[PDB]
Amino acid sequence: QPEMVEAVKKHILNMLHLKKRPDVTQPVPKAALLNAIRKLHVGKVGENGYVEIEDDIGRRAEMNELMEQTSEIITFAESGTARKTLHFEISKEGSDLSVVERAEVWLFLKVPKANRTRTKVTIRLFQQQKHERSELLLSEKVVDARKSTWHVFPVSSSIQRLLDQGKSSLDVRIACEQCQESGASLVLLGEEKEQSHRPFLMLQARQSGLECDGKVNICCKKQFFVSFKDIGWNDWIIAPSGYHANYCEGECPSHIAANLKSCCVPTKLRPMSMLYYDDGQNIIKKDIQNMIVEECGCS
Amino acid sequence: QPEMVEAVKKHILNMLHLKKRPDVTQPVPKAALLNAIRKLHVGKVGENGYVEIEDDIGRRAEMNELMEQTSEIITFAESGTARKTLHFEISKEGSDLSVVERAEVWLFLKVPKANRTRTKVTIRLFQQQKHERSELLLSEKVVDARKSTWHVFPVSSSIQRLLDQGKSSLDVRIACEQCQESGASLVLLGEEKEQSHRPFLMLQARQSGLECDGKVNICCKKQFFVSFKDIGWNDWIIAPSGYHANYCEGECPSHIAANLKSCCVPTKLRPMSMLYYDDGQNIIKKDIQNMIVEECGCS
Ligand SMILES: [Cl-]
Ligand SMILES: [Cl-]
């Protein structure tokens, strides 16, 4: 365990391009430090003097991973069998994704000649479900019918319910009895010169690698969190409080049945930002790549 | 070479969770597509129909790497030997970094009793250089002396010149003859209850792994760019135009003089976003992690 701590310490020093940790010294007073990192927006400070890094690159990494778990699907409407009906055949991708972050229906309201009278019209979207036939109110929206424009119909929860039912098919009847009064018309089939006005459904959805537990020799990640306070480094390391020193252990079966050998290797790496005294007078905010191992696998 | 293309194709399909590429079909008309990805801000379109991804996760990755090459240094002033002089001993970190992105001097103007008369005072910062003694005008700034507040003195180019001269020492004489007229005083030594007003210099600076060239067997990255147009995939792949299929080749010396074996392994991975037809009706924008290999090394 002391050897592990020494190893982690050497690792940190190497990534910071330091030959050793800074000598102890009476540093710049804490008030000065906090004020400086506050004004430069380097570190946000709560009361009692707890410091977090304001522009943490690790948070950006987590955000990127969120994007990596998120897919955006554009489904163009197919003509329905009935009048004023659209068919949406959502890709199987949406079935793999569990959480519906957002879903919109885009319909283009075409107003050939501008009309101020009856400025606003009520558009309704009915999901045609069977078991014989009943209609769900997908969306009831009041829109402006002054000029030709796109209109957006939020249908998040309804698409969520649809996917939860294990379905990716969606037939939509559209109703707008006041539309022609305003001299307006909903482009339901993007045909010919109005083909750039073909309606569509947008769907942004999320989806929601061994760790060493009791696994004997297989390639896995051992989690070893080490607080800087416990290893006597919290004097020159301002932030964060600790370091997730996860590492890859185990052996990997070869390609014997390119390269034959296989190694237990970090397959998922996360960057980490640090705020520290380089000496008694110099505080450094630094962003280090490949600092934290998130997953291990066989090469 | 056809086997390499097949390998890349299989790789892409695997990362997209597809068993094979989508069957050809008469897709949704290009006008509809472009309009849809434009309105949803999924893909920016120039004329002639060239498509780029608007929220490319790869660009975010490049930005993160820029942060990983950038350090921010806070140097607190030490008392000079002369009157109204501050000494800045910049960390050696700044010497490693070549490009000075920005540098500021923060000085706190303390106005005990508010004074509207002589609203503005001229503060000058003189860098005291020798070879006997001459003074450079670091900064000449006109500031408001109504209330006690911080003032920021841009010194980017001057700190750049200092670092270019291979020096990290900086003595600054400060002049403000109009300050006491306005009942103001520059906190030069953050002492006692004014210790949170200790002046400081901020410095944000940048710094500015084998590739297979003719290296026989050492671990390196082979660069293989493949355009989707040339491999007949540009019909269902809307963006980007091609794929940097870089890969790791070579052998790695062992740890014989943990794990003994070492493998040529991607040490630096970059994520890539794709915009593609899942079928004739469904366009998917997806962000894939660990898609592009940027560097290879021995594990
Ligand atoms: Cl130590
Ligand atoms: Cl093919």
Author numbering:
A (entry chain A), B (entry chain A): 51 to 181, 200 to 258, 283 to 300, 311 to 359, 385 to 426
Give the authors' words.
Activins, members of transforming growth factor β (TGF-β) superfamily, were first isolated from porcine ovarian follicular fluid and identified as activating factors for the release of follicle stimulating hormone. Activins function both in autocrine and paracrine manner. They conduce signalling by binding to extracellular domains of type I and type II receptors and allowing the kinase domains of type II receptors to phosphorylate those of type I receptors and initiate the intracellular signalling. During the secretory pathway, the precursors are processed by furin-like proteases that cleave the polypeptide after a dibasic recognition sequence between the pro- and mature domains, releasing the mature signalling domain from the covalent linkage to the pro-domain12.
We have engineered the protein to enable proteolytic activation in vitro, by replacing the original furin cleavage site with a HRV 3C protease site and removed two N-terminal cysteine residues, which by analogy to pro-TGF-β1 are likely to interact with the ECM, to avoid interference with native disulfide structure of the rest of the protein. To improve the quality of the crystals, we removed residues 259–282 (reported to be part of heparan sulfate-binding site19) from the pro-domain. The resulting protein yielded significantly better diffracting crystals, enabling us to determine its structure using multi-wavelength anomalous dispersion phasing with selenomethionine-labelled protein. We solved the structure of pro-activin A precursor at 3 Å and refinement of this structure against higher resolution native data yielded a final structure at 2.3 Å. The structure of the pro-activin A precursor consists of two subunit chains that are disulfide-linked at the mature domains. In each subunit, the N terminus of the pro-domain, starting from the first visible residue Q51, forms a helical ‘forearm' region consisting of three α-helices (α1, α2 and α3), a latency lasso and a β-hairpin. In the structure of pro-activin A, two precursor chains form a cross-armed, domain-swapped dimer. Size-exclusion chromatography in combination with multiple-angle light scattering (SEC-MALS) analysis shows that pro-activin A is a single species with the expected molecular weight (91.5 kDa, calculated molecular weight 90.9 kDa). This uncleaved pro-activin A precursor is unable to induce the expression of an activin-inducible luciferase reporter gene in HEK293T cells, in agreement with previous findings that cleavage is required for bioactivity.
